[PDB]
Design a binder for this molecule. Structure first.
Ligand SMILES: COc1cc2ccccc2cc1[C@H]1C[C@H](O)[C@@H](COP(=O)(O)OP(=O)(O)OP(=O)(O)O)O1
Ligand SMILES: [Mg+2]
Ligand SMILES: [Mg+2]
Length: 540
DNA sequence: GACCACGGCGCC
DNA sequence: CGGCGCCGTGGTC
């Protein structure tokens, strides 16, 4: 019993659609349909039929909305059961997974996807009745955010292709030089991109000591960590590290990105996946524009290739230490709150209470160490690991850990309070009430239990930070539109905007305020803002 | 031509 | 001994 009716569908219908490939900016729309009351309407011509819809409503609504924006159609995404499912349990990441769990079959037919969307929305919307915090997240953050992401994906970012093509040649010559030297020291050619062949050269032929093994197969590891500890053992090691650095950036960024420029837009379009992480973070893929290099000198050159349209500037806004500020709020630790209320640099404050200097006498050597202890405790770093990263005895690493919690006792209290709650309810929660179900919190194997604990007490911090960024994007986007400005990229605690040259300053100031005041905490949120013609100079 | 597992590594 | 996605290799159908 499957009711069929002629195109077009009534208002409020749930859409189903089939793409030739997973990227909506690149996809051919193969079929389109819509279902209401279980009655399914199928479009004779999908592209024409797109014009008849008022909104995109159903599984993966954002994807269809991106394709529609590509065709110059204003078809905003509305209700999407994936978002509901994801808020219920962020392990719900795919239509297939959601259908398997809650009911139905995710197939490759437009009509059935449309019918499935409606059935899943009814089912899932009902499971959320009573869950007012989850429903607030849905109505106020996720659903409106999906429209923000749709415009971000369809706008894309301009890329300096010629610059990257020239950068490619230059890096290739450096790669060729390093390869020759490695062959010389090895005494023969081999595939240097093959870790299996490298393993033999290093540990069988040159007889260097094997330090660690790989997780699944127990091979001798050639990871950067192992090679770092082996720098002094042979001149070939340092050469391999340099090689790895260059080929990593060339094979992942320099060479592939130029070929991903879209013919219609002349820009580069990523995908912002809204139901992909266990914490409420977004992810970026096809290509991933959330891991563009920045740390090393060659990486910074890649950033310069991301630029603004002619007559526009890039506006880069970054939350300063958002996770620690969230931690201050959640824990209520008076010491940690004080640091932020007085506008001091926690990383610099840490180094002072580590090296016994005052906050003025802290060089980057000591702030680099402060970073380690601060993030180490946030993520559950072990004493052994800390002793290695700081190059200190294991016993004084233990003492540093204890001194930290002695200085921030409410943090320790909050961790333990969060885990007990986790053990009891079976999930942990962000400030806004986003949930992550964490099993094995009471596992009888210590290593399993403790791994689960770190996941558990991390999620409220990372997830709250994610909620604040997401909400800021929701509030900011319509202010950007009314100023003729664009949202281009989100990198977890960073936003990149594009604005006309003249309004760039006013957009920068406004965006800063909206982000800083998105949701007031016991501590202020500070936002570093910068303006430039490219991503590097903008952040500089 | 397609797929997948693994080690390895880019970013927050 | 926190959260992601992409690469090349080696193997397979
Ligand atoms: C595994 O976790 C980490 C451990 C670290 C240990 C030592 C050093 C760095 C580390 C970085 C990270 C991850 C997690 C972090 O969110 C991200 C950015 O780290 P930034 O260096 O940008 O820290 P900020 O506070 O922005 O410093 P600043 O910009 O204000 O000077 O990298
Ligand atoms: Mg930073
Ligand atoms: Mg993996």
């Amino acid at each position: 019993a499957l009711e069929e009716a002629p195109w077009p569908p009534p208002e409020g219908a749930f859409v189903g659609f089939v793409l030739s490939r997973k990227e909506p900016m690149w996809a051919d729309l193969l079929a389109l349909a819509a279902a209401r009351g279980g009655r399914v309407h199928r479009a004779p011509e999908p592209y024409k039929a797109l014009r008849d819809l008022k909104e995109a409503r159903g599984l993966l609504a954002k994807d269809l909305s991106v394709l529609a924006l590509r065709e110059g159609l204003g078809l905003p995404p509305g209700d999407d059961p994936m978002l509901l499912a994801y808020l219920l349990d962020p392990s719900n990441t795919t239509p297939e997974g959601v259908a398997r769990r809650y009911g139905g079959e995710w197939t490759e037919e437009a009509g059935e996807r449309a019918a499935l969307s409606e059935r899943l929305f009814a089912n899932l919307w009902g499971r959320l009745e009573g869950e007012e915090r989850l429903l607030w997240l849905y109505r106020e953050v996720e659903r409106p955010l999906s429209a923000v992401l749709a415009h971000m994906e369809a706008t894309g970012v301009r890329l300096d292709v010629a610059y990257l093509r020239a950068l490619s040649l230059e890096v290739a010559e450096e790669i060729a030089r390093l390869e020759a030297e490695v062959f010389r020291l090895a005494g023969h050619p081999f595939n240097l991109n093959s870790r299996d062949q490298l393993e033999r050269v290093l540990f069988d032929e040159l007889g260097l000591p094997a330090i660690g093994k790989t997780e699944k197969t127990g091979k001798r590891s050639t990871s950067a960590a192992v090679l770092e500890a082996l720098r002094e053992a042979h001149p070939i090691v340092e050469k391999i590290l340099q090689y790895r650095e260059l080929t990593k950036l060339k094979s992942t960024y320099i060479d592939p990105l130029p070929d991903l420029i879209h013919p219609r837009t002349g820009r580069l379009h990523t995908r912002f996946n809204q139901t992909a992480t266990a914490t409420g973070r977004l992810s970026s893929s096809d290509p991933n524009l959330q891991n563009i290099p920045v740390r090393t000198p060659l990486g910074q050159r890649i950033r310069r290739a991301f630029i603004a349209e002619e007559g526009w500037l890039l506006v880069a806004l970054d939350y300063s230490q958002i996770e620690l500020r969230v931690l201050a709020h959640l824990s209520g630790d008076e010491n940690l709150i004080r640091v932020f209320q007085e506008g001091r640099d926690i990383h610099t404050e840490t180094a002072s209470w580590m090296f016994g200097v005052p906050r003025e006498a802290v060089d980057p050597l000591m702030r680099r160490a402060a970073k380690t202890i601060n993030f180490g405790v946030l993520y559950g770093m072990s004493a052994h690991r800390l002793s290695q990263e700081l190059a200190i005895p294991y016993e004084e690493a233990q003492a540093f850990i204890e001194r930290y919690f002695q200085s921030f006792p409410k943090v320790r209290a909050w961790i333990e309070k969060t885990l007990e709650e986790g053990r009891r309810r079976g999930y942990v929660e962000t400030l806004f009430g986003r949930r992550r179900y964490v099993p094995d919190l009471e596992a009888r194997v210590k290593s399993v239990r403790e791994a689960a604990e770190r996941m558990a007490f991390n999620m409220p911090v990372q997830g709250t930070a994610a909620d604040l960024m997401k909400l800021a994007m929701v509030k900011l986007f319509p202010r950007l539109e009314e100023m003729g400005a664009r949202m281009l990229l989100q990198v977890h605690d960073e936003l990149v905007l594009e604005a006309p040259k003249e309004r760039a300053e006013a957009v920068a100031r406004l965006a800063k305020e909206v982000m800083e005041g998105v949701y007031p905490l016991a501590v202020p949120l500070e936002v570093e803002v910068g303006i430039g013609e490219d991503w590097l100079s903008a952040k500089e």
